Amino acid sequence: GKTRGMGAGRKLKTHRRNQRWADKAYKKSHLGNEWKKPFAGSSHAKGIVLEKIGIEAKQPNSAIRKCARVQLVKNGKKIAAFVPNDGCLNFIEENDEVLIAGFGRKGHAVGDIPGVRFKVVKVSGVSLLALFKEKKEK
């Protein structure tokens, strides 16, 4: 059972200190490996498109998910970013600047796309939203 002594404050406080490391969220935020990730603790990052690849969807689905492999400017890492909309892959060209964000779920893959946790949100300084909705052109 729990220690209950009046003079037990050290035991309780040190015990909580030790046991908090068993919690995945605490350990994820207090261990430092987020600075080793592609974005290095950033919401967005700019990159240069290296190639367009295209990835299959997992078993219950069947489709080709069209993604662009990007190189991050700040650190030179290489990632794959989904291009969200119908026909927006044709806006992407080779060696153009692109603004990438997370997919949601904070670094964990979304939906049926295997091993992709990044999404393309801007190309050539112009939104994919404005290009898909014809508000602006590049």
Binding site: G5, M6, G7, A8, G9, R10, K13
Partner: protein
């Protein structure tokens, strides 16, 4: 005498030993008499300091140091230095989240006048003075074995 054991003759400041017209009742430290003082704050000058032969510049009762500041009470923890002790203060620190306590301690160096005798683990009362060495800022005033 017993005091003069160092490479220079040790004497109290401002007492003229080789006086001409001496006396036994003028005042402490007048006409050659050994100087002593009462520290104040309700402490009593030990007799061994009164009729003592030791010479200690740092003694509260016969030296030049004044006692002012805080008056801590603790237990002696170490008496293996020359005329200096380490005392332990034991206290309870409150841990607010858990609404409980824990035992903490602090080691305070304090100068011990030769007029006292301390074993290990005697109750000591120390009073604050000016820095006497790198770590010492307190002086022993009472020792209860």
């Amino acid at each position: 005498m017993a005091e003069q054991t160092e490479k220079s003759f040790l004497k109290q400041p401002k007492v003229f030993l080789s006086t001409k017209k001496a006396d036994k009742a003028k005042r402490p430290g007048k006409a050659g008499n050994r100087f002593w003082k009462s520290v104040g704050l309700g402490f009593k000058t030990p007799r061994e300091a009164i009729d003592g032969t030791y010479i200690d510049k740092k003694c509260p009762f016969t030296g030049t140091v004044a006692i002012r500041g805080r008056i801590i009470a603790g237990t002696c923890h170490s008496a293996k230095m020359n005329r200096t002790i380490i005392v332990r203060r034991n206290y309870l620190h409150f841990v607010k989240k858990y609404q409980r306590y824990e035992k903490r301690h602090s080691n305070i160096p304090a100068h011990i006048s030769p007029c006292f005798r301390v074993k290990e683990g005697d109750h000591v009362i120390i009073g604050q003075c000016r820095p006497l060495s790198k770590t010492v800022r307190f002086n022993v005033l009472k020792v209860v074995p």
